[PDB]
Amino acid sequence: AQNPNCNIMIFHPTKEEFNDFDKYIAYMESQGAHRAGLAKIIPPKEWKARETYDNISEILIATPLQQVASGRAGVFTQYHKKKKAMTVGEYRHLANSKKYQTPPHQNFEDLERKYWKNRIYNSPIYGADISGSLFDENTKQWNLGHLGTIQDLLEKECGVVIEGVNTPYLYFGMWKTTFAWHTEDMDLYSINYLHLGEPKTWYVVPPEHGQRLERLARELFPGSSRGCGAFLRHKVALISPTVLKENGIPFNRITQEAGEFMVTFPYGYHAGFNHGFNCAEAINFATPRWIDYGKMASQCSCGEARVTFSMDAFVRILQPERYDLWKRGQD
Ligand SMILES: O=C(O)CNC(=O)C(=O)O
């Protein structure tokens, strides 16, 4: 078995290897990358996502989210308070302000220590989940707006034609902005490209051990667990690496820098934080190996998780027994 310790692997494809996305994902899996839940892909030196980032300031963040924390430093939830719209240029200035800017630090490890010590005492503002793309249309390799769609994958594997679309999302981050512990909708893959700015630190649990994280989370968030049998689908709970180590939960961590891709694999729980002003682009995707994970994915039916139009078909076809209850949660 390849990668039996479930380490995060880093890949350096050549320009030739970067042509066929599906093939390269399958190669990474052949080397055991999926066992970690997360992989880094450094693009060939010839490649670029677009020519410059000099003209992005007029993109609108229609609903910036202030991430307010409750709990203790290592075990907390966050809720998202909606703020007034602002442009990317206004958000960048905000991120760089004395109130929100990254503090002085020695290295990534010192910054990680400061994040876990101090996150809860601040409420950073995140521009998340903005439909759109920063890939130049002429970028033909690993262009996250030109991937094969999950609807087409389901149709190719299973023969059923379904409605729905699959488009990318932009994320504009600042120091301390936080992504809570989650797997993807329907335990899909994700791919994330850090277009510009400061790094993003990731934490991940191997898919084969995801239920260990879920059992810890039910212990640590006992009211939330009683409210919903899949509350991590709400994407609000944080647990620090120190707490994970104290409870024996297997995980790994890595820092993504600008110009790098990360892939999350089916049922790989992940969480993380931004180091400073940045912009990432991410999308879900599927492969043949996902289908079995999609069929087994947990679902939130309490009403909190509320998701895209396109998840309807996935539930309906892959999980027909769960469909009625899940749809009630959506309505
Ligand atoms: O970058 C973020 O805030 C969150 N991204 C992801 O969870 C991802 O790409 O799957």
Ligand SMILES: [Mg+2]
């Ligand atoms: Mg612009």
Ligand code: NI
């Ligand atoms: Ni994710």
Ligand SMILES: [Zn+2]
């Ligand atoms: Zn729920």
